[PDB]
């Protein structure tokens, strides 16, 4: 009896047992633990090779078990109908908190309770950085562990006091330490190895903004190209059909095809096949969300419209033409601004992003100061038509407008295909 | 449309950065009212419960800070008592009696 | 993967279809094969060699064998960078020297790789002596006109010659379709 | 039985109509997080 | 265009090859200021890097 | 050995500095705990100016 070593259960009588479901499925003990909770009783582990053991009467359980884990870790346990039968109460921690001055004061109090010394400016800057890390203006990130780590780094750089300037130094150091990939990218762009047009017009070439998934979070431009050929209505997305991708009808490809066909019906057969590709790779594509860049590049290729290379184009587009929000807009805009700065700002570069992402825009202070200086113009659009009008500079109205030129291009492709079909009947 | 600076300026205006600020610590699960109410329900009723949320939310830290503030009726002392060298039963006693 | 699309094939097909719209229903199928193996193919980037060879096959263009060609190309025709330009250029120069240099041997490499050219002392000396030539191009048109030795537009313009070849393929297919009536 | 328990805890000893309403509302509210995020996104204009 | 030898000449012009060089050792992580500063931060703060 | 001493765990007061190729850290970087423990990343740029 004196060799019984108490476990977790033998110490939480009348109390609270805090568990990690991740461990419960990683050690495979969830079955036994669930059975014990079902029984309301449990016995210590008995080694099966010791017949001269103790038939210990199961230890009664009178305690609140409060599992802890990620939402992803609980689906492995939610299959069991006993799981929802035992734990009736689900407390979901909101990933974001309301960004209000009361919450700013709460954050300051929490950091002080952590033992940090911070000036009011430092608290304001940390609150702003938390809002940015949540990537919404009015919701500050609740990941207080990350805020605590950032405050640690700022205190080390500030000597012990979280002055504002120390917090900007910590944020800059955070960016700089994982900046190697972007250093190589910018150095290549300057060296000309990766030529990205940041000036002038180009027909069918657009400067899309992508988040590299060959690397951690870093928005960078990728020159996206679209070429139009007279033929079938089939639309080929090369990056989404590099293999085992042409047998799958990707939602992005079908979305682009639907918008293109239903937008223009005088040649509703869609006499044009559109080839979409990315210059080089390091390009990672959703393959399930058609990009506004692809749509505008395809329209420019169809209508032979010189799009501005000054303005980057980002955004997910729906077949109605309604531009949707995209994740990690801040990284994309910052990356394009960095690439523009490395090549030198001409005062005309900019970014075209959905109006939906307006509440997600929390740009780094350098971009903001550039914007206030009239050197980097952030254009927000609602529908693909506005973005196309901004790129081409002209409107959808008047003689030789964008719509007229797109119609003329589709008509030329249609007549070329009709002449080809004449050759197939003679 | 061309966004102006003012619609883009989101940084909270910094007023003073030369003086330290003292603030009372916020209650556990501050701005996390859903978790607070769910935990209060799971505690008053003594129901089993589970917290979910993205990693690095400090769920353990905040949860342990909140639970320690809770006051619970004094638990009885539970202890293994051997009725023989093969049978060991479980004995419950008032607090501090073991 | 004989039934799987490739980035190189789609890239070249897009470029060719877009560049000649007066025959958009591209009337000619092109077979790209490497004489000899030991050829290790990237499979994710279409070499400028593939594109210029396809163009010469279309237009019956006699390309110069003096100059080698290397470099990836997009579906627009922009000649991109490729890794290890030094090794390729040195290899071609050695092969030329073993057969004996004649002062016209050369390499076609993208201007993007100019920030990578760290050629050996022997190659640099051959260049300084005018025995080995390095031509840097940016778009497939420039490389094609360099290899063919003539300009794209004008008398015997390469674009016109490729158009003539495609039109010949089109009229041949029309004559074959004449038999399809029966 | 589980919902009645939740109502009893909120009432303390009795399943009054108000306690049952509060328990049902809490049932909805505890797993309301995804819909809360959805409505916040809709209001903020992230999803239009 | 045919690149000139001058444009392709990248070897540093060798001036002297007859006398030994006497140079002080470089600072650790020379030209690796990213890693150097990251380790400075990791050392002053005592974080795990 | 059933004669194991009930050894008190040895406290750790050191900075751990992992070293390895970017490939090696890709496996460990997946873990949400790894980014929490090791958060200072010192990258060695494969080239110097």
PDB file of N, CA and C in Angstrom, chain D residues 11-43:
ATOM      1  N   UNK D  11     -30.068  29.144 -11.943  1.00  0.00           N
ATOM      2  CA  UNK D  11     -31.131  29.576 -11.060  1.00  0.00           C
ATOM      3  C   UNK D  11     -30.763  29.316  -9.617  1.00  0.00           C
ATOM      4  N   UNK D  12     -29.981  28.264  -9.405  1.00  0.00           N
ATOM      5  CA  UNK D  12     -29.446  27.938  -8.101  1.00  0.00           C
ATOM      6  C   UNK D  12     -30.134  26.749  -7.467  1.00  0.00           C
ATOM      7  N   UNK D  13     -31.464  26.722  -7.511  1.00  0.00           N
ATOM      8  CA  UNK D  13     -32.187  25.565  -7.024  1.00  0.00           C
ATOM      9  C   UNK D  13     -33.461  25.245  -7.775  1.00  0.00           C
ATOM     10  N   UNK D  14     -33.791  26.037  -8.790  1.00  0.00           N
ATOM     11  CA  UNK D  14     -35.094  25.955  -9.435  1.00  0.00           C
ATOM     12  C   UNK D  14     -34.961  26.143 -10.939  1.00  0.00           C
ATOM     13  N   UNK D  15     -35.760  25.393 -11.696  1.00  0.00           N
ATOM     14  CA  UNK D  15     -35.816  25.524 -13.149  1.00  0.00           C
ATOM     15  C   UNK D  15     -36.947  26.476 -13.501  1.00  0.00           C
ATOM     16  N   UNK D  16     -36.746  27.758 -13.232  1.00  0.00           N
ATOM     17  CA  UNK D  16     -37.710  28.750 -13.674  1.00  0.00           C
ATOM     18  C   UNK D  16     -37.539  29.003 -15.168  1.00  0.00           C
ATOM     19  N   UNK D  17     -38.566  29.606 -15.770  1.00  0.00           N
ATOM     20  CA  UNK D  17     -38.517  29.884 -17.200  1.00  0.00           C
ATOM     21  C   UNK D  17     -37.321  30.759 -17.546  1.00  0.00           C
ATOM     22  N   UNK D  18     -37.031  31.753 -16.705  1.00  0.00           N
ATOM     23  CA  UNK D  18     -35.870  32.601 -16.940  1.00  0.00           C
ATOM     24  C   UNK D  18     -34.580  31.796 -16.890  1.00  0.00           C
ATOM     25  N   UNK D  19     -34.476  30.861 -15.943  1.00  0.00           N
ATOM     26  CA  UNK D  19     -33.279  30.032 -15.862  1.00  0.00           C
ATOM     27  C   UNK D  19     -33.124  29.165 -17.103  1.00  0.00           C
ATOM     28  N   UNK D  20     -34.223  28.595 -17.599  1.00  0.00           N
ATOM     29  CA  UNK D  20     -34.148  27.778 -18.806  1.00  0.00           C
ATOM     30  C   UNK D  20     -33.727  28.627 -19.997  1.00  0.00           C
ATOM     31  N   UNK D  21     -34.292  29.831 -20.113  1.00  0.00           N
ATOM     32  CA  UNK D  21     -33.907  30.725 -21.197  1.00  0.00           C
ATOM     33  C   UNK D  21     -32.431  31.076 -21.115  1.00  0.00           C
ATOM     34  N   UNK D  22     -31.943  31.372 -19.911  1.00  0.00           N
ATOM     35  CA  UNK D  22     -30.536  31.713 -19.747  1.00  0.00           C
ATOM     36  C   UNK D  22     -29.641  30.531 -20.083  1.00  0.00           C
ATOM     37  N   UNK D  23     -30.037  29.323 -19.681  1.00  0.00           N
ATOM     38  CA  UNK D  23     -29.233  28.146 -19.989  1.00  0.00           C
ATOM     39  C   UNK D  23     -29.174  27.891 -21.488  1.00  0.00           C
ATOM     40  N   UNK D  24     -30.305  28.019 -22.179  1.00  0.00           N
ATOM     41  CA  UNK D  24     -30.299  27.825 -23.626  1.00  0.00           C
ATOM     42  C   UNK D  24     -29.461  28.904 -24.301  1.00  0.00           C
ATOM     43  N   UNK D  25     -29.600  30.151 -23.849  1.00  0.00           N
ATOM     44  CA  UNK D  25     -28.805  31.233 -24.410  1.00  0.00           C
ATOM     45  C   UNK D  25     -27.322  30.982 -24.196  1.00  0.00           C
ATOM     46  N   UNK D  26     -26.951  30.464 -23.027  1.00  0.00           N
ATOM     47  CA  UNK D  26     -25.553  30.152 -22.768  1.00  0.00           C
ATOM     48  C   UNK D  26     -25.075  28.995 -23.634  1.00  0.00           C
ATOM     49  N   UNK D  27     -25.939  28.007 -23.874  1.00  0.00           N
ATOM     50  CA  UNK D  27     -25.592  26.934 -24.799  1.00  0.00           C
ATOM     51  C   UNK D  27     -25.258  27.494 -26.170  1.00  0.00           C
ATOM     52  N   UNK D  28     -26.085  28.414 -26.656  1.00  0.00           N
ATOM     53  CA  UNK D  28     -25.804  29.031 -27.945  1.00  0.00           C
ATOM     54  C   UNK D  28     -24.543  29.883 -27.878  1.00  0.00           C
ATOM     55  N   UNK D  29     -24.343  30.576 -26.758  1.00  0.00           N
ATOM     56  CA  UNK D  29     -23.308  31.600 -26.688  1.00  0.00           C
ATOM     57  C   UNK D  29     -21.921  30.992 -26.527  1.00  0.00           C
ATOM     58  N   UNK D  30     -21.826  29.837 -25.868  1.00  0.00           N
ATOM     59  CA  UNK D  30     -20.519  29.224 -25.667  1.00  0.00           C
ATOM     60  C   UNK D  30     -19.907  28.760 -26.980  1.00  0.00           C
ATOM     61  N   UNK D  31     -20.714  28.201 -27.879  1.00  0.00           N
ATOM     62  CA  UNK D  31     -20.254  27.813 -29.204  1.00  0.00           C
ATOM     63  C   UNK D  31     -20.607  28.853 -30.259  1.00  0.00           C
ATOM     64  N   UNK D  32     -20.765  30.107 -29.848  1.00  0.00           N
ATOM     65  CA  UNK D  32     -21.127  31.209 -30.724  1.00  0.00           C
ATOM     66  C   UNK D  32     -19.910  31.853 -31.371  1.00  0.00           C
ATOM     67  N   UNK D  33     -18.712  31.351 -31.070  1.00  0.00           N
ATOM     68  CA  UNK D  33     -17.490  32.050 -31.450  1.00  0.00           C
ATOM     69  C   UNK D  33     -17.363  32.186 -32.960  1.00  0.00           C
ATOM     70  N   UNK D  34     -17.576  31.095 -33.696  1.00  0.00           N
ATOM     71  CA  UNK D  34     -17.428  31.162 -35.145  1.00  0.00           C
ATOM     72  C   UNK D  34     -18.404  32.162 -35.744  1.00  0.00           C
ATOM     73  N   UNK D  35     -19.654  32.134 -35.292  1.00  0.00           N
ATOM     74  CA  UNK D  35     -20.628  33.097 -35.779  1.00  0.00           C
ATOM     75  C   UNK D  35     -20.314  34.507 -35.308  1.00  0.00           C
ATOM     76  N   UNK D  36     -19.737  34.655 -34.116  1.00  0.00           N
ATOM     77  CA  UNK D  36     -19.306  35.978 -33.685  1.00  0.00           C
ATOM     78  C   UNK D  36     -18.248  36.536 -34.623  1.00  0.00           C
ATOM     79  N   UNK D  37     -17.268  35.710 -34.990  1.00  0.00           N
ATOM     80  CA  UNK D  37     -16.249  36.146 -35.936  1.00  0.00           C
ATOM     81  C   UNK D  37     -16.868  36.467 -37.284  1.00  0.00           C
ATOM     82  N   UNK D  38     -17.828  35.654 -37.716  1.00  0.00           N
ATOM     83  CA  UNK D  38     -18.484  35.896 -38.995  1.00  0.00           C
ATOM     84  C   UNK D  38     -19.200  37.239 -39.000  1.00  0.00           C
ATOM     85  N   UNK D  39     -19.978  37.518 -37.954  1.00  0.00           N
ATOM     86  CA  UNK D  39     -20.694  38.787 -37.889  1.00  0.00           C
ATOM     87  C   UNK D  39     -19.739  39.963 -37.767  1.00  0.00           C
ATOM     88  N   UNK D  40     -18.652  39.807 -37.009  1.00  0.00           N
ATOM     89  CA  UNK D  40     -17.679  40.887 -36.924  1.00  0.00           C
ATOM     90  C   UNK D  40     -17.049  41.159 -38.281  1.00  0.00           C
ATOM     91  N   UNK D  41     -16.736  40.102 -39.030  1.00  0.00           N
ATOM     92  CA  UNK D  41     -16.195  40.282 -40.370  1.00  0.00           C
ATOM     93  C   UNK D  41     -17.199  40.986 -41.269  1.00  0.00           C
ATOM     94  N   UNK D  42     -18.473  40.602 -41.173  1.00  0.00           N
ATOM     95  CA  UNK D  42     -19.493  41.225 -42.012  1.00  0.00           C
ATOM     96  C   UNK D  42     -19.632  42.704 -41.682  1.00  0.00           C
ATOM     97  N   UNK D  43     -19.673  43.042 -40.394  1.00  0.00           N
ATOM     98  CA  UNK D  43     -19.788  44.443 -40.006  1.00  0.00           C
ATOM     99  C   UNK D  43     -18.572  45.241 -40.449  1.00  0.00           C
TER     100      UNK D  43
END
